[PDB]
Design an enzyme around this catalytic site. Structure first.
Site, PDB file in Angstrom:
ATOM      1  N   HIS A  39       0.822  -1.194   0.000  1.00 35.90           N
ATOM      2  CA  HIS A  39       0.000   0.000   0.000  1.00 35.90           C
ATOM      3  C   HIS A  39       0.882   1.281   0.000  1.00 35.90           C
ATOM      4  O   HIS A  39       2.032   1.258   0.420  1.00 35.90           O
ATOM      5  CB  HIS A  39      -0.818   0.070   1.289  1.00 35.90           C
ATOM      6  CG  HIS A  39      -1.709  -1.091   1.589  1.00 35.90           C
ATOM      7  ND1 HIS A  39      -2.826  -1.405   0.844  1.00 35.90           N
ATOM      8  CD2 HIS A  39      -1.634  -2.016   2.571  1.00 35.90           C
ATOM      9  CE1 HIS A  39      -3.407  -2.494   1.312  1.00 35.90           C
ATOM     10  NE2 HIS A  39      -2.721  -2.873   2.388  1.00 35.90           N
ATOM     11  N   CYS A  76      -4.850   4.862  -1.730  1.00 36.91           N
ATOM     12  CA  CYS A  76      -3.803   3.891  -1.968  1.00 36.91           C
ATOM     13  C   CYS A  76      -3.787   3.652  -3.487  1.00 36.91           C
ATOM     14  O   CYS A  76      -4.813   3.236  -4.050  1.00 36.91           O
ATOM     15  CB  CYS A  76      -4.126   2.573  -1.210  1.00 36.91           C
ATOM     16  SG  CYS A  76      -2.872   1.358  -1.683  1.00 36.91           S
ATOM     17  N   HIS A  79      -4.778   0.028  -4.863  1.00 35.13           N
ATOM     18  CA  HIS A  79      -6.112  -0.410  -4.468  1.00 35.13           C
ATOM     19  C   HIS A  79      -7.164   0.679  -4.595  1.00 35.13           C
ATOM     20  O   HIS A  79      -8.268   0.581  -4.049  1.00 35.13           O
ATOM     21  CB  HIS A  79      -6.049  -0.810  -2.951  1.00 35.13           C
ATOM     22  CG  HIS A  79      -5.110  -1.981  -2.805  1.00 35.13           C
ATOM     23  ND1 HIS A  79      -4.088  -2.042  -1.892  1.00 35.13           N
ATOM     24  CD2 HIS A  79      -5.054  -3.149  -3.518  1.00 35.13           C
ATOM     25  CE1 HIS A  79      -3.426  -3.162  -2.005  1.00 35.13           C
ATOM     26  NE2 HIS A  79      -3.994  -3.865  -3.002  1.00 35.13           N
ATOM     27  N   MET A  84     -10.047   1.841  -1.791  1.00 36.78           N
ATOM     28  CA  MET A  84      -9.169   2.129  -0.627  1.00 36.78           C
ATOM     29  C   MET A  84      -8.808   3.611  -0.609  1.00 36.78           C
ATOM     30  O   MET A  84      -7.779   4.085  -1.122  1.00 36.78           O
ATOM     31  CB  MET A  84      -7.910   1.283  -0.700  1.00 36.78           C
ATOM     32  CG  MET A  84      -7.203   1.298   0.686  1.00 36.78           C
ATOM     33  SD  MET A  84      -5.941   0.004   0.719  1.00 36.78           S
ATOM     34  CE  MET A  84      -5.188   0.431   2.280  1.00 36.78           C
TER      35      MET A  84
HETATM   36 CU   LIG Z   1      -3.468  -0.491  -0.783  1.00 40.62          CU
END
Ligand SMILES: [Cu+2]
Length: 91
Positions: A39, A76, A79, A84
């Site tokens: 991340h 992120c 993601h 996210m």
């Molecule tokens: Cu992530």
């Protein structure tokens, strides 16, 4: 003060936890790699508070100090498509 935000929720979701947090101007946020790495954190419009390098290992942390009041959205990159995304409200 310093507040912590987990990257990857304890229940297995691709999310920051807590997904919305409110802090005071001058406080530091620490992000901690929790589950489903890697991340990173990009704070919209704020390159100086962002950490574009990926975090791969569990427990890896990085921080940012928010000195200006306002609402900040961050995400992120890998993601982002899975939702996210988080919000920091600086009081
Ligand atoms: Cu992530």
């Amino acid at each position: 003060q310093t507040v912590a935000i987990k990257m990857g929720a304890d229940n297995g979701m691709l999310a920051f936890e807590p997904s919305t947090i409110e802090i005071q101007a001058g406080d530091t946020v620490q992000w901690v790699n929790n589950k489903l790495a890697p991340h990173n954190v990009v704070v919209e419009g704020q390159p100086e508070l962002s950490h574009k390098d990926l975090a791969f290992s569990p427990g890896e942390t990085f921080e940012a100090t928010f000195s200006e009041p306002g609402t900040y959205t961050y995400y992120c990159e890998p993601h982002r498509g899975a939702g996210m995304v988080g919000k920091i409200v600086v009081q």
